[PDB]
Amino acid sequence: MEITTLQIVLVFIVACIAGMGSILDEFQFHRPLIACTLVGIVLGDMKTGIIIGGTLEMIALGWMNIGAAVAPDAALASIISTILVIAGHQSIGAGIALAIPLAAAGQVLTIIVRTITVAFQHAADKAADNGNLTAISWIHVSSLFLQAMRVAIPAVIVALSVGTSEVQNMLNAIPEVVTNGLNIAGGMIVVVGYAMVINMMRAGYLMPFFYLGFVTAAFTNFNLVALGVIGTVMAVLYIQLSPKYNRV
Amino acid sequence: MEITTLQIVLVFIVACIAGMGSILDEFQFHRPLIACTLVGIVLGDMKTGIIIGGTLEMIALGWMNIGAAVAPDAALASIISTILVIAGHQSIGAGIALAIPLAAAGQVLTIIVRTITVAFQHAADKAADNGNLTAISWIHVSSLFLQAMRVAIPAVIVALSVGTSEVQNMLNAIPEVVTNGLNIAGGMIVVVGYAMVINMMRAGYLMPFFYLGFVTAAFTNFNLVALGVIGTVMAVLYIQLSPKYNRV
Amino acid sequence: MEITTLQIVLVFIVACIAGMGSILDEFQFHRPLIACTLVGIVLGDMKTGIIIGGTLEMIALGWMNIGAAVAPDAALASIISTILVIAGHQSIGAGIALAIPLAAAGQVLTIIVRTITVAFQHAADKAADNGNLTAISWIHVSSLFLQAMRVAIPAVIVALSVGTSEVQNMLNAIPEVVTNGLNIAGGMIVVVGYAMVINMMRAGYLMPFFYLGFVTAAFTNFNLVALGVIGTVMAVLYIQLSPKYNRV
Amino acid sequence: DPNTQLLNDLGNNMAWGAALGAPGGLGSAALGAAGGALQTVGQGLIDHGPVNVPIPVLIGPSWNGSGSGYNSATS
Amino acid sequence: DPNTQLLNDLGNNMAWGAALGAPGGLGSAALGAAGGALQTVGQGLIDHGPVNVPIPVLIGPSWNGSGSGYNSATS
Amino acid sequence: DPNTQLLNDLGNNMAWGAALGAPGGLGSAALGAAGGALQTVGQGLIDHGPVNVPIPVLIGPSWNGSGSGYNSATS
Amino acid sequence: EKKLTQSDIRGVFLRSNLFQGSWNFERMQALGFCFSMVPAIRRLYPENNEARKQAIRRHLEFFNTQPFVAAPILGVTLALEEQRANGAEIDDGAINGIKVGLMGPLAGVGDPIFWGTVRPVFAALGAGIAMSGSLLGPLLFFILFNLVRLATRYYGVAYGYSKGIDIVKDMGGGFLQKLTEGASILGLFVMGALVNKWTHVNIPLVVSRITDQTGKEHVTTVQTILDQLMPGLVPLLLTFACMWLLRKKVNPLWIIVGFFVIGIAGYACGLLGL
Amino acid sequence: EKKLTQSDIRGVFLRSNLFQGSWNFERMQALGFCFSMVPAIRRLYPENNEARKQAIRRHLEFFNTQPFVAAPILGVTLALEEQRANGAEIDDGAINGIKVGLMGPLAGVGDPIFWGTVRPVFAALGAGIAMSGSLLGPLLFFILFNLVRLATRYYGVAYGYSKGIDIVKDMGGGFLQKLTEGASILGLFVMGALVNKWTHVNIPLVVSRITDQTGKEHVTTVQTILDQLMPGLVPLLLTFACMWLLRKKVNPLWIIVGFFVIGIAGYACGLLGL
Amino acid sequence: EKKLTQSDIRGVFLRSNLFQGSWNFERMQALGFCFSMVPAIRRLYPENNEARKQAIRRHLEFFNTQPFVAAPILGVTLALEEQRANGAEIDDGAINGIKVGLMGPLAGVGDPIFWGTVRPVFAALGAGIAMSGSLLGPLLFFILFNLVRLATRYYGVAYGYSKGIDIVKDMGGGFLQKLTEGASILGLFVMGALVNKWTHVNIPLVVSRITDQTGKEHVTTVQTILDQLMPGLVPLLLTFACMWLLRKKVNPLWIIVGFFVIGIAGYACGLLGL
Ligand SMILES: OC[C@H]1O[C@H](O)[C@@H](O)[C@@H](O)[C@@H]1O
Ligand SMILES: OC[C@H]1O[C@H](O)[C@@H](O)[C@@H](O)[C@@H]1O
Ligand SMILES: OC[C@H]1O[C@H](O)[C@@H](O)[C@@H](O)[C@@H]1O
C-alpha cells in the first residue's frame, strides 16, 4: 500500500514521542504495547497494531536498562516492525522475526547518542560558571531532540521506501558479532554504575557488607525483597551497637 | 449388642477423664491410643479397641493445639468411634470414616467451652480483690467440670441409643463450610498468641530480630532446633557488644 | 622375570624416598603419579608405570590426611602394585585390584610409626633442658628414617620373592574388620585435632562462633571459600564494634 | 465496536469523576479523573477474566546472560 | 494371653523396683518403680523389633494448611 | 620417542631460562629455570588438548564416610 | 523473715499438673499460673493486708507458654517473690518483665519439641506396635511420655528456683535486665520463624491459566504471586494488624471471633481456598 | 529569610518527569538532577554573587539512581538547601554525602521492584489481553503504570521534603551521619547482591570432555571450575578493577568503551561464550 | 643488639621443607616447628644462660596446621622473638597466643584449598594425560604443584616476617590482641563448619521398615532420626567430649587409641555401619 503525506507526518510525530520516551523511561511510550497501537492507529487498522504489540511485549519483558547497561531498545523494533507489517504487507510472524536485529540496531544507535550527550554535560558545566539557570534548562531539554531523531529518521526512511525489501538487506550489515557482542558486553557493564557509586561513597570501613551481600546472593534462595529486609535490619542493629553513637 | 448399666457408668467415667485430659494436655488420656483401649476394656474386647486406637493415632499425629488455634480434638472422635464399632457392630474402616466429622464437632464444642471459661477468669479477678486463695483454687478446679461434661454427655447419649443410625445423620448437620472453615480460621489464629506475647514484651527496639526470624524461615532449610541455636548465639553476642553493659 | 641386584638397590632407594614423602607431604613423591613412574623407570618400561600411576591416582584423589586422621597411604599401594605388575607379570586390572588392601596395610603401618615417634618427641623435650640445638636437629631428621623403612622393607621383600603368589595370601590376614574399621575410626578422629586447637585457644567467650559455624554448614550450600569470607567479615565487624577497643 | 465502546466508557467515567471532585478543587479534579479511569480499566479487566500468559515476577535483565524469570534462577 | 503376661511382668517389675528403693526413702521408691516400668516396656519393645510406620520428626500443626512432615516442608 | 623428546625440550628450556637470568644473579637463575620448565609443561598441555577425567574441585576426605566430590554433597 | 519450705515446692509442683484447665481466649493459662503459686503466696503473705491482693493481681495477668516448660518460670518467680517479700526491692515490672521475657523462647522451642518431635515419635512407636494389637503400644506411649513430662516438670521447678535464687544474690549487677534482653531476643527470633512456618493463608483467585506440556495447565493464582514476592506475607500483615488492635485495648476475644468469622465466610465465598 | 513556596514544590515535581533525557556515560542523570532543582535555586539564591555558582556546581556531580525513587532524595536535598541558605551550616559534604548515601539503596531496591516486578506484571496483563486485540491491553498497562509512577513521584517529593525538614530541626543530635551510615550499609549489601545476581561472564574453554551415560558428554569448562569455587567471581574482580581505575581519576567513558571492545573482541575470538 | 641476618631467613625457609617428619599423635608438628626455628634461636640466644632453654621450651608446644601455610606463622614468630630478645617485653602468652590464634584459620582454609582444590586439580590433569601414557602427566603434576608449594613457603616466610615487624613497631596500640581475637573468631567459625562437613558417624539400627512404592522399602534408622534433628550431632558431642577430656589433662594418645578401638569394635558389633 501507499502512504499519504499526512500519515507520514503522523508517523514522524509518533516516532519522535517513542524516541524521547526511550531515554526518559517515564510514560512508557516506547514500550511496544503503546508504540505499536499508536502506529496502527495512525496507519490503518488498530487490530493488527494491538496484536503485534501484545506479541512483542512478551519478548520485550526484561529489556531493562540497568546503570550504563543498555538493553536492546524496544522502541525502534516496535515501530519499524509494525510499519513493515501494516504497510509492507507481511505476516505478523515475519515482522516479529525482524524484532531482534532491529533491537540490536537501536541498541547501537542509543549507545552512540548516550556518548554524544557528554558534550551537553560539559556545556552545562561551562554554563554553571556563569550562574545561568535558564541555560541549564535549555541545555537539558535540548538533549532530548537527539534521542527523538534517533528513532524518527529511520522510521521515516522506512515508511518512504516501503515498496522495497532493502531494509531486510540492510539489517544484515551488522553480521553476528556485534548483535551478540553487545549483550555480552552488557553482561559486565552492569558493574560500572555500582562501582562508581561505591567509589563516591568513600566508606571503606563498611566494605565488609559488600562481600556479605555477594556470597549471600551466590549460595541462597533469597529474594531481593528479602535481601532488602535483611540489609535494613543489619543497618538498624549496627547503629544500635557501635559505641560511636552510644556515648555517655 | 446391648450395654449393661455398669458399663454405661464406666464409659461415662472414661469419657469424663478423656474430656479433662483434652484441655489439660498433660497425661494424654485424650489421645486415641489410650482412650480407645480404655473404652474397649470397659466395653468388651481390648483387641478391637487397641487396633482402632493404633489406626486413629496415625491420623491424629499433628493435632497440636498452638496458642489459641484449636485442633480437631481427638478425644470425642476416639471415644464415639470405638463405641460405635464395638457396640454398634460396624467395621473398623466404617468407624474410622466417622473420625473426621466427629473431630470437627469436638472442635466446635471445645471452642465454645473455651469462650465460656472467660466468666471463670473474671470471677477469679473479683475473688482477687478479697485476697481469697481458696476461692481461686475452687474457681480453677471447677472450670474442668465443663470440659469433662463436653465429652461425657454425647458419649452417654450415643451409648444409650446405639440401636439406631441417627448419629451418622446428626453428623451431617455441620455441612462442609464449618468443617473446613474452622481449619482455615486456625490457619490464622496461630498468629494471635504470638501477637499478644510480643505486645506484652514492650521491646520495640528488638523488633528487627522478628523480621530476621521471618525471612530466615522463608528461604532456608533451617530446623527449629537450628533456629533456636542461632537465636541463642545472637542473644549472647548482642549482650557481649552493646555498650550499655560494657561501661567502664 | 628376575630382577638384577642393581634394580633391587634402585627400588630400595625409590621406596625410601616414597616413604619419607609419605610423612613429609611436601614434594608428593608418595603420590602414585610419581612413585609408579619411578618404579617403572627403574624396573623396565616407563609405559606401564605411567599408566598404572594414572589409573591409581583417580582412586587416590581425596586421600587427604586431616589432623590425626590418617588416609589409606597411597605410597605402599603405588609401589607394591607396580612391582607386582611389571615384575610379577599380572594384568593392570589385577594389580589395581590389590590397591585397596595394600592401602589398608600401609595405613596400619603408618599409624604404628606415628605412635612410635612420641618417644622422639620426649627425647627432644629432654634435650631442651640442656639447650642443645644440634641435638634437636638430629632428633628431628632422625625420625624420618623410620618412615622410610616403613615402605622400603616390604618393597624389598616383595621384590625378592616375586616368583610366588604369597603376597596375595598375606593380604588376607587383615580380614575385613580392620580394613573398614580404620576408615570408620577416621570418621571421628578428624574431631581430635580441632578439639586440641580449641582447647589451647582458651577463648570461651568466642565459642558462640563455633556453633554458628556448625549449623551453617548443616543447612546451607556454602563453600569453604564462602565460609572463609563470611568468617573474615564477622571478625572485622566484631572488632569494629566491641567497645573494649573503641574506648575514648 | 467493543474498542469504541470502551473509549466512550472511559471518557464518560473520567468526566464524571472530574465533576464529582469539583467542590474539592483543582487538586481533587485529578484525583477524581484518575479514579474514574482506574475504575473503567478495572471493570474491563474483571469482565475479561483470566489470561493465558506466564505473569513474571522479580525478573532481571536476562538479555545479557543472566538467569531468566523469578530471581534469575533459571540458568 | 500375651497381654495378661505383659501386665503381670509390669506389676512384678514395678513392685521389685519399689522394693529395691526402700532404704533410700519414699523419694526413691518412685525412682525405683519408674525404672521398673521403663525396663519392662523397653524389654518388650526390643522383643517386638522394628515397626512398619513412618516415624515423624519435627512436624507442625499440619491440620490448617501448613506443610506436613519434617519441618512443614511438603506443601 | 615422544617422552625422550619431551625430556630434551625440558632440559633445553630450563638451561635457556637459567642462562637468561644470569645477570640478575643466583636468586634469578632459579626464577628463570622455573619459568622455562613451566613454559615447557604448559606448551605440552596446550598441544595435548582437553582430557577425559572428571576434574574434582573442593573435595574432602571422602574415605571415611563423608560426601564425595565438590563440597562433600553427594551422600 | 519468711522463706519457702521444701514442702512448698512439691505443692507448687503438684498443682502445676493442672496448669491448664482454666484456659480462656482472654487471658490464656493465667488462672493456672495463679493457681499453681497458691502455696507460695500462702506463706510469703500470711495476712490480707494489702500485699496479698497485689501479689494475687500480679499473677492474674496474661501468661501463655508450652505447659511443660513452665516449671522453670514458676521456680524463677518463686525466687523473685521470696526476695521481694523478704524486703529486697524488685519493682513490679521486673517480675512480670522476666515472666514475659521467658514466655517467648520457651513457647517457641517448647512446641516444636514436645508437640513437635517428642510426642509423635512415641505415639508412632506405640501406634505401630498397636497395629498387631498388643498392650505394649498404649503402655509404651503412656509410660515413655509421662516419664519425660514428670521429669521435666519437677526438675524444671527445682532448677528454676535454685538458679533464680542466685540471680538476686547479686542484685545491682545488672543480671535481670541482661536475662530479659537475651530471652526477648531469642523469643522474637523463634516467633518470627514460627509465624512463617506454621501459618497458612491461601487466596485461590486465578490470574493466568496457560495450557501447555500437553495439558499441565500451569494455573497461577494471587497466592502464587504473593508467595513469589514473600512467602507468608499475609500472615505477617495479620500479625501486625493484631498487634495494632491490641495496642488500642481491644479485647482478644473479639479478635479471635473476628478471625473465625473471616475464615468461615471467606471459605464460603470461595476466596480463602484451603 | 528565604523559604520554599508551595508553588516551588510542584515546580520541582513537574520538572522531575524529565529526570533523564540528558543521560551521559560520564555523569549519568546528573544534569537531570540539576535541572529539576532549578526552581529552588532560583529562590534560595536570587542573585549571582558566589553562592549561586557553588549551589549549581554542587548538583552537577555524579548522581545515578532509579528514576522514580529519586523524588525522596529531591525533597531531602530541598530541605537541606533551604536550611543551608537560611544560615545553618551544613558543610558541603553532608549534602553530597546524604545524596550519595541514598543513591545506593534506592537504586538497589528500585530496579528489582519497578523494572523488576511492577512493570512486567502490568505489561504481561496488558499483553495477554491484547492477544485477542482489545484496547484494554495497552490502556490497562498505560493507566496502571502511570498511576503508580505519578503517585510515587509526587508523594516522594512531598514526603522527602517534610521528613528532611525534621532531620535538620535537631542538628547536632547526630542524625545526618546516622542516616548516611545506615543508607550506606543497606546500599552496599544490596549492590553486593546485585553484582552477583545480574551479571554474567562465561568463559567456554573446554577442560575435560568425559563421555558417559550413553552420550551425556558431560563437558566441563573453565567457567564450571570458577563457578564451583565462587559463582560470579569474574564480575567481582571486574568491579574491583573498575573501582581501582576510578580511584586513579580515569574518565568513566574510557572504562565503558574498554568494556564494549573487550566484549566484542572476546566473543569474536571465541573465549567469551554467551 | 641482635638482629636476624638475611642468611637466617633462607635457613628458616630451607628447614621448613621438612616441617613434618617428626609427626606424633601427642604434639603433632611441634618438633618440626622447633626444628625450623633453630637458625634463629642460634642467633638471638648465642649462649645457654637461661633464656635459651626457655626459648626452646616455648616452641616445643602443641602446634598443628596445614604444612604449607605455616610460613606466615614462622615469620611472625621470628619477628616477635627478635623483638623479645632485643628487650621489648612480649611475655610468654602473646607468642604462643598468636601462634595458636593463627593455627585455627590457616588449618581451616589451608586443607580445603591445598588438599582441597589445588592438589586434585593438578593431579586429575596429570592422571588424565597419563592415561595415554606420556611423561607430561607426572611432570605436569610435579612441576605445577611444587611451583605453588615453594612459592607459598618462601613468600609466606618473607611476608610474615615483614608484616610482623610492623605489628610490634606500635606496641601498646593494642594490635596483637586485635589480631588474636580476629584470628580466633575466623578459626572457630571454619572449624565449626569443618566438624560438620568432614566427619561421619552412622548408626544403622533399623527403627521402621515400611514397605511401599511397589518395594521401595523405605528403611529408617537411628541415624535418620538424628540427621533430621541435627546433621552431624554425634561428632559434635564427640568434640565436646574430647575437649572435656583434654581439660582433665588426659594425654591425647589415649584419646586417639580409644577412638580406634571404638571404631573397630563398633563396626565388628555392627552398630557403627559405614
Ligand atoms: O538503576 C540505575 C539506573 O541507571 C540509570 O539512571 C538508568 O539506566 C536507569 O534505568 C537505572 O535504573
Ligand atoms: O504454645 C502455646 C501454648 O498455648 C496454650 O497454652 C496451649 O494451646 C498449648 O498447647 C500451646 O503450646
Ligand atoms: O590440617 C591439619 C594438618 O594436620 C597435620 O599436620 C597433617 O595431617 C596435615 O596433613 C593436616 O593438614
Residue numbers in the entry:
A (entry chain B), B (entry chain E), C (entry chain Y): 1 to 248
D (entry chain D), E (entry chain G), F (entry chain A): 4 to 78
G (entry chain F), H (entry chain C), I (entry chain Z): 13 to 286
Give the exact sentences the study uses for this entry.
Once in the periplasm, MccE492 inserts itself into the cytoplasmic membrane and stably associates with ManYZ, the inner membrane component of the mannose permease (man-PTS). Subsequently, it kills target cells through depolarization and permeabilization of their inner membrane, thereby disrupting the proton motive force. MccE492 has a modular structure, with a toxic domain at the N terminus and an uptake domain at the C terminus of the mature protein. The structural analysis shows that the N-terminal toxic domain can be further classified as a man-PTS recognition domain (mPRD) and an α-helical domain.
A total of 92,052 selected particles yielded a three-dimensional EM reconstruction at an overall resolution of 2.28 Å. As with the apo-form ManYZ structure, the overall structure of the MccE492–ManYZ/MceA–ManYZ complex reveals a threefold symmetry axis perpendicular to the membrane, in which MccE492 and ManYZ assembled in a 3:3 ratio. In the MccE492–ManYZ structure, the mannose substrate is localized in the middle of the membrane. Therefore, the ManYZ structure in the complex is identified as the occluded conformation. The Core domain undergoes a rigid-body rotation of approximately 47° and a translation of approximately 11 Å when switching from the inward-open to occluded conformation, with the substrate-binding site remaining unchanged. Before the glycine–serine motif, a zigzag-shaped structure (L61–T77) is embedded into a pocket formed between the Core and Vmotif domains. Binding the zigzag structure of MccE492 prevents the movement of the Core domain. Region II (G63–S71) forms a hairpin structure and specifically interacts with ManYZ, which is proposed to be the principal component to anchor MccE492 to the receptor. Therefore, the hairpin structure of Ser65–Ser71 specifically determines MceA antibacterial activity. The α-helical domain has a helix-turn-helix motif, and the V-shaped two helical bundles display amphipathic characters, one hydrophobic and other hydrophilic.
